[PDB]
Design a protein around this ligand. Structure first.
Ligand SMILES: Nc1ncnc2c1ncn2[C@@H]1O[C@H](CSCC[C@H](N)C(=O)O)[C@@H](O)[C@H]1O
Ligand SMILES: Nc1ncnc2c1ncn2[C@@H]1O[C@H](CSCC[C@H](N)C(=O)O)[C@@H](O)[C@H]1O
Lengths: 207, 206
């Protein structure tokens, strides 16, 4: 039972035309709380938790795989969170969806590592996407990155440094470094069970 | 008192390094690049890198004379002539080298000084980052490896805040194949129990 008409019925959580609201996302939520976005909201357990945890922040999740954003809309439907919208769009469309400074933070969780050299350009921490984040947040923004992948994290650290961003937080073992209020992602729960360390970085723009 | 073998081996352990500021090419006899290690220890590292790379001039610094003696002995057993050693504190680096005279600085398993009041004693603190810039110029780099998650985590932020560019970073050095890697004494000990060894390379922006 493949369900795509499901996303049309819940068009109040899954905005089927997000480009229309560029510059006007404050009207979409009804308040001017800061908008934080997650670029890879696979299954929406994280975004839902951060919403319930922080009612005074407006969360917008982005997902490319429609097979999995469906699960995300269901978690937002169950959590009854009213400060969560979801976009089934590609990260390259960020500048068509948000005006500079409309976004205040970007959350990156367990993104695809694309280990091969030819696929650096597809990594969500590559300078192309680093630019897209600068273009929607301005220089008053930050990136909150967590991943299990040593390769992707190692690369991301260099990529942040090369782009000129300031490292304000870095953990090389998140579940042994006490972080108050940490919402685990689906991928975080599984690789945590595996006893593998989870890396976390906070990176922000210089001003 | 006494018990110093350093006077007899004054050709490896330079007992007056401030005299040679600006003139270290005369101390070696060539213009091979000068790499320095801060916090040498028993000298296993500096000796290995010297024998491995005869075309680089290595100068190791150590504060405790009890342990630099072991370092001069390892340099004595190896036949490397491109190793000098200084029994001095990292602060006097600007009294020993002219800007641009040093090309790289090696930091291995430095003291972490975990509590906040002793941040200023850490060898990756902005004070020392300046001292390294002042002896290397903008053409220098730092090659840091340590077992300490705390110190590495801090150092990465410290490098970023100071404005240095991260060109290499390993969060598991013995699973990331590094070809020219010479293990330090402390590296061998913390390698036991499989603790991960972190490594970073940072260089100045231009
Ligand atoms: N360019 C892009 N735009 C949007 N989503 C993307 C993307 N590239 C990858 N993704 C999505 O990002 C997710 C990363 S894997 C799942 C991560 C999730 N935070 C978790 O921890 O469970 C995948 O669902 C993938 O399809
Ligand atoms: N400011 C300073 N100047 C010089 N040496 C210092 C120093 N602070 C600490 N040290 C020395 O640096 C060493 C740190 S322990 C590391 C030993 C060696 N690098 C190894 O990896 O095996 C100790 O010998 C300590 O006494």
């Amino acid at each position: 039972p493949w369900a795509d008409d499901f996303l049309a019925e819940n068009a109040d959580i899954a905005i089927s035309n997000p480009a229309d609201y560029k510059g006007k996302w404050n009207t979409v939520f009804g308040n001017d709380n800061p908008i934080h976005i997650e670029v890879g909201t696979g299954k929406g357990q994280f975004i839902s938790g951060m919403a319930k945890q922080n009612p005074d922040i407006n969360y917008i999740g982005i997902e490319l795989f429609k097979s999995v954003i469906v699960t995300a809309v269901q978690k937002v439907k169950d959590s009854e969170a009213q400060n969560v919208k979801l976009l089934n769009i590609d990260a390259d469309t960020l500048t068509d969806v948000f005006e500079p400074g409309e976004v205040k933070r970007v959350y990156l969780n367990f993104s695809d590592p694309w280990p091969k050299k030819r696929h650096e350009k597809r990594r969500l921490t590559y300078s192309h996407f680093l630019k897209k984040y600068e273009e929607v947040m301005g220089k008053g923004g930050s990136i909150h990155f967590k991943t299990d992948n040593r390769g992707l994290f190692e690369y991301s650290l260099k990529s942040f440094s090369e782009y000129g961003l300031l490292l304000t937080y870095v953990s090389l073992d998140l579940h042994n470094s006490n972080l108050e209020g940490n919402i685990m992602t689906e991928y975080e729960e599984k690789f945590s069970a595996l006893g593998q360390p989870i890396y976390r970085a906070e990176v922000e723009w210089r001003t």
